[PDB]
């Protein structure tokens, strides 16, 4: 986020001229008027509380004022660059946890009309870790039941990570990329109820393994070497607060102190490679279709392009692979819990509460200016949050709205949110994904009471401020707060 811009204008400005393009819509939302960056097709908006508002406008002035080396790209500027993409509708939107990233800002959503021939798809609008996501499992155990054996549970979970639960040959992987969680179901590593409580039923149709490069496929095949890359993250959690008892009851969360397990994983290097190969092929074809962007990292292809069609089919394939990896972690988590407590996984009520993505592009029906349209919704660092009574969400959540899982870092709380009708109207059903940015840790976590198994010692916008901002804006609703007692990052 520095010299990736083409030689362009609008850069002979100071903080006061940039403030001219900025107006506050309401208590929790700001407007970016056109002209903030070149070639804006729609306006931009971001959601703030008084704290996150300070950091956003400080990051603007620190880069805008200049007077030093850097030229760092503010999140407010990347929002506008995304608003300059052909095909975008409504507005490019920054969720409360918006921070700067490759082309798109992390936490910056934008949707494109699939009936517009100039509409494009941007891999930078999905992210390199395609379909990194969160999965929440409930248990019938209480904190008093788990707190004594938390070290053994964490060790058993850590020891279960390395070992056929994951596609171990290229042929199995080609099926996993095509079938998503349907591969795990056939191979015994997933329950049927896991699919019904999973975004897109754990499988994105029309995925094509032929659109995934051979290097990408080998990046996704298991390696006994190079373990410790950090792609596996798990957290044994305790229900610390229930803001909505009925939403919690429909998720099986019966009381405070109940134990849950949170799983965080993605496509590892397969998605990184799928995103990279697309970016290269798109750079070479943007001229043929005459696409103009402000940021070279906004490299995109038209949806109708062969390169745009290839990416989405490959992107869907990596998303399927990510669900297979989280199902295998579920299978190993279920096995870890089964052995420590010496029973069967079902007798511990180890069902999937929900599973969301936050690095994916989805084809969704949305109403734009009173007209139903088919939109390609880019969500990098943002979570889908469908409202109550959406016909395509689980029957169990037809009255609560779609559960939204918020990732919590080491020692940080996690949240379960619900979708809202207001979020479908304002943000196309989009909400935050977690926190943003801009041995000592070991003893702090131990003193907090958190057992920790981490492979290598190599391994801000507060999540609380972010979820409270979304709750106040009405684009999400707080339901559960979870506290970690064991963190497993291998
Ligand atoms: Mn993630």
Numbering used by the authors: -9 to 153, 159 to 433, 446 to 466, 475 to 505
Q: Can I see the authors' text?
A:
RNA ligases of the RTCB-type play an essential role in tRNA splicing, the unfolded protein response and RNA repair. This active site guanylylation reaction relies on the activation factor Archease.
To address the issue of nucleotide exchange, we determined the structure of nucleotide-free RTCB with a single Mn2+ ion to a resolution of 2.6 Å. In contrast to our complex structures, the nucleotide-free RTCB structure contains only one Mn2+ ion in position A, coordinated by residues C122, H259, H353 and one water molecule in tetrahedral geometry. The conserved residue H227, which coordinates a metal ion in position B, is not involved in metal binding and rotates away from this position compared to all previously solved structures. Concomitantly, the α-phosphate-binding residue N226 is moved out of the nucleotide binding pocket. The displacement of both conserved residues, which is not present in previously solved RTCB structures, is due to a rearranged loop region from Q218 to Y228. The conformation of both loops in our nucleotide-free structure changes the accessibility to the guanine nucleotide binding pocket. Hence, the structure of nucleotide-free RTCB provides an additional open conformation of RTCB-type ligases with regard to the active site. Strikingly, the conformation of the aforementioned loops in the open state would sterically clash with binding of Archease. It should be noted that the engineered His tag and protease cleavage site were still present during crystallization of this RTCB construct.
